Amino acid sequence: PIPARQLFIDGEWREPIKKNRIPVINPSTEEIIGDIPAATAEDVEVAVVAARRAFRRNNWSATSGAHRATYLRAIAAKITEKKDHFVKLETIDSGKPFDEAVLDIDDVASCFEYFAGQAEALDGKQKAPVTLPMERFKSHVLRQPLGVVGLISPWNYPLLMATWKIAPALAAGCTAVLKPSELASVTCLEFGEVCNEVGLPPGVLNILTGLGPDAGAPLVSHPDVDKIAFTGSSATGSKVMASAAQLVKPVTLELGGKSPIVVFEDVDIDKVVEWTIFGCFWTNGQICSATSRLLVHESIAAEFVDKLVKWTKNIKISDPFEEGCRLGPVISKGQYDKIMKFISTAKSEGATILYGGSRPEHLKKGYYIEPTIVTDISTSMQIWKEEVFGPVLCVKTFSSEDEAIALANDTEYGLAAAVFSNDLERCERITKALEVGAVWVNCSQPCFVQAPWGGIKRSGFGRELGEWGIQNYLNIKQVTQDISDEPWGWYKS
Amino acid sequence: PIPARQLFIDGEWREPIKKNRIPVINPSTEEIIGDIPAATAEDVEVAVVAARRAFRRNNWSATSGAHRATYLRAIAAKITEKKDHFVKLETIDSGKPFDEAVLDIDDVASCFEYFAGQAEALDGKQKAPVTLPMERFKSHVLRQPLGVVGLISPWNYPLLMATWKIAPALAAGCTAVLKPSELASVTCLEFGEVCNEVGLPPGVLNILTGLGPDAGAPLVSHPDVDKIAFTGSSATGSKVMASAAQLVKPVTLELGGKSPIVVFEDVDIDKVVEWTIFGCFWTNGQICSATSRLLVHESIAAEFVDKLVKWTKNIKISDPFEEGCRLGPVISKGQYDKIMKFISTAKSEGATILYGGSRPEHLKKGYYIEPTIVTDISTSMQIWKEEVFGPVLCVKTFSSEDEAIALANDTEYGLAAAVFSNDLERCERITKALEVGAVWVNCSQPCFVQAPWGGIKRSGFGRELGEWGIQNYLNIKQVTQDISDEPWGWYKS
Numbered sequence: 001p002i003p004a005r006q007l008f009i010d011g012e013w014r015e016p017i018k019k020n021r022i023p024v025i026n027p028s029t030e031e032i033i034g035d036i037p038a039a040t041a042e043d044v045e046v047a048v049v050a051a052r053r054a055f056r057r058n059n060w061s062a063t064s065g066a067h068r069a070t071y072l073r074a075i076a077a078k079i080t081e082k083k084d085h086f087v088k089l090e091t092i093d094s095g096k097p098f099d100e101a102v103l104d105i106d107d108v109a110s111c112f113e114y115f116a117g118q119a120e121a122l123d124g125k126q127k128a129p130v131t132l133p134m135e136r137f138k139s140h141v142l143r144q145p146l147g148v149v150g151l152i153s154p155w156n157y158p159l160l161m162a163t164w165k166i167a168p169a170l171a172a173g174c175t176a177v178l179k180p181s182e183l184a185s186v187t188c189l190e191f192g193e194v195c196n197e198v199g200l201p202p203g204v205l206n207i208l209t210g211l212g213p214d215a216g217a218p219l220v221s222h223p224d225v226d227k228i229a230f231t232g233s234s235a236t237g238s239k240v241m242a243s244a245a246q247l248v249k250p251v252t253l254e255l256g257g258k259s260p261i262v263v264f265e266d267v268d269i270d271k272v273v274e275w276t277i278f279g280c281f282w283t284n285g286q287i288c289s290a291t292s293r294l295l296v297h298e299s300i301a302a303e304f305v306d307k308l309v310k311w312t313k314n315i316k317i318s319d320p321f322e323e324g325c326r327l328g329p330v331i332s333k334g335q336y337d338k339i340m341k342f343i344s345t346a347k348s349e350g351a352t353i354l355y356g357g358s359r360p361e362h363l364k365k366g367y368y369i370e371p372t373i374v375t376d377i378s379t380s381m382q383i384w385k386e387e388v389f390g391p392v393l394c395v396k397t398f399s400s401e402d403e404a405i406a407l408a409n410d411t412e413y414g415l416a417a418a419v420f421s422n423d424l425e426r427c428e429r430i431t432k433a434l435e436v437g438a439v440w441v442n443c444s445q446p447c448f449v450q451a452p453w454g455g456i457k458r459s460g461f462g463r464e465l466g467e468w469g470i471q472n473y474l475n476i477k478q479v480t481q482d483i484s485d486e487p488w489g490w491y492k493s
Numbered sequence: 494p495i496p497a498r499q500l501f502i503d504g505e506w507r508e509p510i511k512k513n514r515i516p517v518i519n520p521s522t523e524e525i526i527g528d529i530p531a532a533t534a535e536d537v538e539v540a541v542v543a544a545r546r547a548f549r550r551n552n553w554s555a556t557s558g559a560h561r562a563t564y565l566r567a568i569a570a571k572i573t574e575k576k577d578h579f580v581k582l583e584t585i586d587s588g589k590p591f592d593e594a595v596l597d598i599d600d601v602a603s604c605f606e607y608f609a610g611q612a613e614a615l616d617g618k619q620k621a622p623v624t625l626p627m628e629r630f631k632s633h634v635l636r637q638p639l640g641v642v643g644l645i646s647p648w649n650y651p652l653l654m655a656t657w658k659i660a661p662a663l664a665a666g667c668t669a670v671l672k673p674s675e676l677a678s679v680t681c682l683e684f685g686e687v688c689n690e691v692g693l694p695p696g697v698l699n700i701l702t703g704l705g706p707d708a709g710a711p712l713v714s715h716p717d718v719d720k721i722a723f724t725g726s727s728a729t730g731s732k733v734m735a736s737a738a739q740l741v742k743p744v745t746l747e748l749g750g751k752s753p754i755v756v757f758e759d760v761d762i763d764k765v766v767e768w769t770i771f772g773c774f775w776t777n778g779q780i781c782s783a784t785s786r787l788l789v790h791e792s793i794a795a796e797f798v799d800k801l802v803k804w805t806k807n808i809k810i811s812d813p814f815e816e817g818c819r820l821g822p823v824i825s826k827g828q829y830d831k832i833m834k835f836i837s838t839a840k841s842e843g844a845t846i847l848y849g850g851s852r853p854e855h856l857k858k859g860y861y862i863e864p865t866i867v868t869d870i871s872t873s874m875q876i877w878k879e880e881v882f883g884p885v886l887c888v889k890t891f892s893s894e895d896e897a898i899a900l901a902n903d904t905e906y907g908l909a910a911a912v913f914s915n916d917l918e919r920c921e922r923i924t925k926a927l928e929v930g931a932v933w934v935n936c937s938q939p940c941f942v943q944a945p946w947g948g949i950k951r952s953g954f955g956r957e958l959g960e961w962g963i964q965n966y967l968n969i970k971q972v973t974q975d976i977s978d979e980p981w982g983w984y985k986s
């Protein structure tokens with residue numbers, strides 16, 4: 001029983017103006033389980049217009065952070081109260097294991113709770129004094145919402161990624177149009193009803209589902225959208241920013257990557273191996289910050305890889321709703337094909353499939369893929385360079401720190417990295433040298449809402465979460481006042 | 494007495510690779526008084542390589558901010574020492590009255606001193622801890638230089654606008670390539686000598702003078718440049734960001750505007766009139782933040798208007814070196830033509846040229862334009878919409894406060910605005926309502942390095958100066974560490 005909704009615009013359920021709709025496919029069974037509306041430019045026009053009027057009213061954007069925080073905590077509470085519903089809907093549609101989805105939904109609650117406090121902190125930052133060296137002038141800073149924002153979220157954490165954008169935008173006092181991925185939109189549409197139950201003012205959040213080209217692209221190009229927040233592939237990020245440039249519209253981008261996990265010899269191998277599979281295979285490999293390039297010190301390489309491979313065999317590939325399930329199907333046929341082609345090309349280029357590379361034997365149907373390990377890698381192969389976004393790991397060995405650092409930085413990406421070593425002095429050295437936005441030490445993949453997140457290089461720019469997240473949605477307004485009533489005395493009179 | 498320089502690359506003076514030069518014109522005489530090296534894509538390539546090299550060395554980017562602050566203070570002292578040299582050069586190059594150039598070169602020194610302060614305080618921000626909920630993980634933030642940056646600065650405050658970008662970039666630990674405007678590059682080139690004399694490591698700052706498409710565009714699209722800071726026209730900002738989009742590289746943009754000065758009945762007219770003059774006619778009207786749209790209350794419009802022209806007539810237009818000069822030529826023939834066309838077009842549209850609109854008849858050579866006041870304006874007119882960048886003021890009346898805000902916000906731009914009223918509670922209302930990044934209360938145009946500066950809407954995005962400027966050049970790196978030494982316990986062995 002998959003919900004059936006319209007678009008969420010101005011607090012109402014509205015059918016797309018041209019009434020089109022697209023299927024919702026369960027990645028486990030490969031067959032349609034329902035539908036979602038497919039918006040077009042006409043609908044964006046309506047949603048943005050609704051966003052702008054909600055911005056202009058006297059019950060949201062000009063109110064205090066403390067006021068909006070009540071709605072943010074209500075949202076978190078309404079999410080928690082309905083966690084069972086959301087977890088299940090996230091588990092079908094997206095395809096990640098049930099145990100992954102429960103942690104997702106718990107995190108969207110924590111995220112709204114965290115940004116509620118941040119909204120509250122915002123008030124305490126209004127009219128912050130700025131010291132001037134002329135007693136004639138006083139100065140302070142106001143922090144006001146930019147206006148109407150376009151939020152474009154990816155399908156690997158459907159509600160949670162949307163939350164990372166929605167929560168700071170609302171905290172800041174902006175109003176928003178959210179466009180989730182057509183691959184996994186059901187929980188995001190459900191969120192629309194959470195907004196009504198908490199009495200979020202009509203138009204403050206608008207949710208348009210649909211194809212990127214049909215719904216997303218006009219959101220980005222709309223002349224009354226003040227800012228875009230995009231999470232996605234680097235390729236699409238170039239397009240979004242190019243589009244935003246024609247109206248010189250600001251943009252924050254987090255664009256995935258090819259992140260390295262560097263493993264030195266002085267490690268407890270069994271623990272590090274468990275992080276290594278968590279860094280590449282969790283979320284079915286579909287992790288923007290996946291540590292897909294394992295760089296392991298030559299001396300423990302043989303032992304590491306062997307411990308690695310049957311840790312990998314003990315991971316249970318099943319239907320998402322099955323107990324103990326630790327790997328679901330990848331999100332779509334399209335993704336399925338691409339990941340299998342990456343595997344095929346890897347071999348054709350002369351790499352070895354040390355393990356996997358095929359559909360699991362005990363799962364005839366569904367876009368399932370065994371956790372794949374690739375060795376015999378030269379840095380020239382496409383599998384070393386390109387983002388696979390599937391449960392495939394690449395292994396290479398290295399001599400020393402210099403080779404490790406060089407190999408780890410040998411990508412045009414720069415999102416994250418993980419370094420593993422009992423020498424903490426060495427851990428600090430590598431962290432400083434890694435050309436990335438986030439470094440895990442003796443772990444891989446924990447993302448707390450408390451701390452700043454974002455990449456550099458082809459992984460994008462801007463920082464979300466932590467005390468940076470709300471700043472992306474703010475107009476920093478300088479206010480400078482002449483308090484002397486003396487003439488300026490520059491001209492003559 | 495005007496220097497003949499080469500490009501400043503890797504600490505030494507280099508002939509452009511294809512060896513071109515372009516003239517330096519005194520805007521006051523229309524005389525060619527010298528020439529400047531004209532760099533091309535080949536020279537950009539050499540400068541970027543030199544900057545990358547200098548970034549990888551151990552004497553700059555990974556040193557402390559305390560260490561880099563000694564250089565910034567040496568630069569401030571060198572500038573103050575050579576104050577007379579730089580002021581004379583800025584005056585003859587840019588056309589601005591000598592007394593204005595005096596304030597500009599003082600401010601340059603002030604900017605390097607303030608950011609010396611910012612560099613120092615960067616050290617106390619390193620490894621700032623971030624409290625996590627789970628005792629297993631610890632977190633902190635590192636603030637590291639982004640890498641090699643491209644700085645593209647305008648001609649209206651030549652050395653000062655460059656400093657606004659150079660000072661924080663060096664503070665952050667970046668290496669930079671600066672491309673000043675070809676209409677006014679002399680002092681920026683002379684800055685290369687300041688760098689050698691304080692011993693800045695070679696390649697840390699590189700100065701490429703030359704034409705926009707030849708030197709600027711290659712810098713923007715260069716694959717080893719990690720970020721661009723641009724100030725200039727909105728039309729060019731769009732093309733800059735579009736180019737940056739290709740490689741998804743971050744930009745900051747400050748793109749001028751059409752800023753309103755709003756004047757209510759409860760004011761001292763002689764004092765507000767002087768600020769109105771300063772906000773539109775100072776820097777020969779070449780102010781990115783010029784308050785070029787006078788909105789004056791109906792009840793006092795008549796008086797205000799001709800007290801305005803009284804003051805205006807008293808403005809000494811002359812050669813900038815002449816004692817008492819309060820208005821010099823605009824920068825170039827091109828700008829002179831465009832400004833005249835703006836005036837020509839306004840009267841064809843039916844506006845009144847109340848005063849000025851012509852070349853001053855006591856000055857037969859030089860790009861001199863009379864301060865111009867245009868009344869009988871419809872908001873449909875070009876001169877109400879488009880940035881003139883000349884000494885040209887637009888005047889419109891209003892009845893209500895609602896109408897004033899409406900008119901003030903009736904623009905695609907949003908850089909600055911100024912509000913005049915002795916009623917301060919009313920001043921506070923208006924400041925909150927104005928869709929701009931900078932509001933002046935009972936004054937017009939004072940920019941202190943202590944306060945953040947930038948616009949919204951088509952005036953761009955990002956904040957320079959104050960405690961914001963250095964952050965545009967940092968990689969905010971999250972570092973999170975598992976300190977538990979226990980299995981993750983997610984995957985079964």
Ligand SMILES: *[C@H](O)C[N+](C)(C)C
Nearest residue numbers: 287288289445446447
């Ligand atoms: C944490 O690893 C970041 N994501 C978005 C991947 C959860």
Ligand SMILES: *[C@H](O)C[N+](C)(C)C
Nearest residue numbers: 780781782938939940
């Ligand atoms: C302050 O007025 C800003 N400018 C750039 C004009 C000096």
Ligand SMILES: [K+]
Nearest residue numbers: 025093094183
């Ligand atoms: K789906």
Ligand SMILES: [K+]
Nearest residue numbers: 518586676677
């Ligand atoms: K000049």
